[model samples]
Target: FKAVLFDLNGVITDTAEYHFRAWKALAEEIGINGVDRQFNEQLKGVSREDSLQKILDLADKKVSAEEFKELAKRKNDNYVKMIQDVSPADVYPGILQLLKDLRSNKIKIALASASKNGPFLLERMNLTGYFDAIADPAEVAASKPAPDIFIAAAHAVGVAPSESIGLEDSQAGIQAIKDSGALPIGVGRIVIVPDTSHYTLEFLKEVWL
Candidate 1:
């Protein structure tokens, strides 16, 4: 049997822009730049907290650990608010049918998202019942680019690495899948790479399991 592991942001839902906007606002408050014009490519597949820290580094700012935590919390709050208007239509085009086809093919579906709000977004989009298991790094101590979240997800689904395939939108996610010893298939900005392809919500509508 095979297992299909999915990433949440820009995979099952379209909250990446909302995240970028919120993060940008927080960045402005903290004196960073590049918030208004689709900064998603830069933070792709990275955790909300980690991306913030990286921005701080780029801005030459040094925040204490406690300060960093507060910033992360604030960013998440703003992100959630910014995404409040996202509807089911914003969900990747063919995901609903794809989920059904994969399930019909006896493939196990697992959600491996670094975002803590993944479950909430799934629920909001009315796509919660599709996955067999949901694993977010927020539930664990690690985030993307680490094997912990993906490894934990494999365990949750009781699937071996060889039998599982991970879908990613960014480098960090692809790295996580690789670190977890699963086949990583990427879909996003990168034009050419092993198992990587161009995909958007509409293109994903026709994606087969």
Candidate 2:
């Protein structure tokens, strides 16, 4: 493959828990109860607006457009503060090694995350230099499940989507990659590398070949 597009949250580092905490805190502050881990699972890979709308729907609550923007910002602000302590040590097992291998092999790498804070988190984790490009969600016309971000990532790396591999840990992300005309490699429970110890360049070549 000419390039590998990666979804940042679960695939690179697990910020899902932090997201849940921030959302839950916001939900509680807004008088919405029962925003548990199970419910948070559904919010995965979705946009902040979509997630907030879902939560509102669950609570049968309504908010003005202005209030909606404020709530989203509040959640993100809390989340940003929570992740401020992130370091290179927080990167997922074997992922750092895999990134190094990809770089050494001259394979282009790009971040296809939905989060606008993708670059910030990458820097916090000291992974900024590893990426050739980070597809800005604001620049994309649509988010995940639409293929826009993944397609942009492929273009950013000057590679055809058909010749790239997109790695993700969310169902929506997998769908996005598939629709983007790239091979979708699921990373978490979906298990592209069942044992992280096997997440080597040779293993990736085996799949690509």
Candidate 3:
């Protein structure tokens, strides 16, 4: 692979729990349920708006477009505050080292997170300045599972999608990588995510390619 394309939520930081908490709380307060734990897996790597909408739908609350926008804002407001407290101790154990390894090899790294809040998260996590380029939701409205974000990231790094490796935690994100015609790598063991995505740790350990 020419470049490594990564999702920020679970792939880099353990902040999926943070986003999960904020969104679930907002959803529950607004009358949504079953969002306690399972909802985290569903949203990890997908669009922030779509993630909130999923919880709203599951909670049986029909938020209008404007309402959804407001809810999304509220969720992010809380999520950002939660992320503010996180430190290097919270990053996935092997990830920072892995990023260093990839960088040592001179492989271009591009972060493609669906959340518009991604850059802030990266900065606070001290993962800033490592990536060659950063891609986020405000620029890519198509979001994950659509490939537009990945496509933009690949181009940002000046690499062909086929020569890129896309690492994501959500099935939707894997689909988006596949849609971009890039190598798809999955990060977690959640069953709901499609099986087509490659599991990150396992694949990285095996081929080290």
Best by TM-score: 2
Clashing residue pairs found in predicted model 3 = 186-198
Candidate 1 collision pairs:
94-205
For model 3, how does the per-residue alpha-carbon lDDT over 114-177 read when each residue is reduced to its tens digit? 8777777777778877888887577785878789899888888999888888878778888988
Q: Write the per-residue lDDT of candidate 2 for residues 1-209, one digit (tens) a residue.
A: 88999898877887899999999999999999989999998887788888899899988888989999999999999999999988998888788888999999999999999898889989989899899999988889877788999999999999988989888888899989999999887876623655445566787778886
Alpha-carbon TM-score of each model against the true structure: 0.84, 0.94, 0.84
Give per-residue lDDT, candidate 1, residue 129.
82
Worst 10 residues of 1 by lDDT: 190-199
lDDT of 1 by residue, 170-195 (tens): 78888888888877767664222232
When summed lDDT is taken over every stretch of 10 residues in candidate 2, the lowest stretch is 189-198
For candidate 2, the lDDT comes to: 0.87
lDDT of each: 0.74, 0.87, 0.75
Estimate the lDDT of model 3: 0.75
